[PDB]
Amino acid sequence: ARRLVMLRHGQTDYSRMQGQLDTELSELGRTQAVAAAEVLGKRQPLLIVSSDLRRAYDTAVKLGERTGLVVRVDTRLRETHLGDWQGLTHAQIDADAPGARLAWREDATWAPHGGESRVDVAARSRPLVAELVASEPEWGGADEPDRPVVLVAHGGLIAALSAALLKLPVANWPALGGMGNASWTQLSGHWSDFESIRWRLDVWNASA
Amino acid sequence: RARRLVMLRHGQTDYNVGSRMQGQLDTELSELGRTQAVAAAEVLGKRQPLLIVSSDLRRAYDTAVKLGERTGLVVRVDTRLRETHLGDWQGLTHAQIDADAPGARLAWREDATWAPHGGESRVDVAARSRPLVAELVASEPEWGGADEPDRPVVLVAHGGLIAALSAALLKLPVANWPALGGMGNASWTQLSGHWGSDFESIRWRLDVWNAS
Q: Are A177 and B205 in contact (CB under 8 A)?
A: yes
Interface test with chain B among A107, A158, A172, by most B beta carbons within 10 Å: A172
CATH number of the domain at B190, please: 3.40.50.1240
Distinct helix (H) and strand (E) counts, chain B: 6, 6
Q: How many domains does chain B fold into? A: 1
Model resolution, angstroms: 1.9
Q: Is A188 part of the contact surface with chain B (CB cutoff 8 Å)?
A: yes
Q: Are A139 and A149 in contact (CB under 8 A)?
A: yes
A193: exposed, middle or buried (C-beta count within 10 Å: 0-12, 13-18, 19+)? exposed
Q: Residue B155 sits in which domain range? A: 1-212
CB within 8 Å of B41: residues ≥ 6 apart: B66, B67, B69, B70, B71
Look up residue A131 and give its amino acid: E
H helices present in A42-117, as ranges: 54-67, 90-96, 100-104
Tell me which H or E stretch contains B131.
helix B122-139
CB within 8 Å of A149: residues ≥ 6 apart: A2, A3, A4, A5, A45, A46, A47, A49, A132, A136, A139
- Which of B116, B111, B113, B65 lies closest to B90 in space, CA to CA? B116
Residues of chain B numbered 102-121 and touching chain A (CB < 8 Å): 110
Q: Hey, are the CB atoms on A204 and B203 less than 8 Å from each other?
A: no
| Active-site annotation holder among B28, B83, B85, B142 | B83
Alpha-carbon distance of B100 to B97, in angstroms, equals 5
Q: Is B177 part of the contact surface with chain A (CB cutoff 8 Å)?
A: no
H helices present in A10-98, as ranges: 27-41, 54-67, 90-96
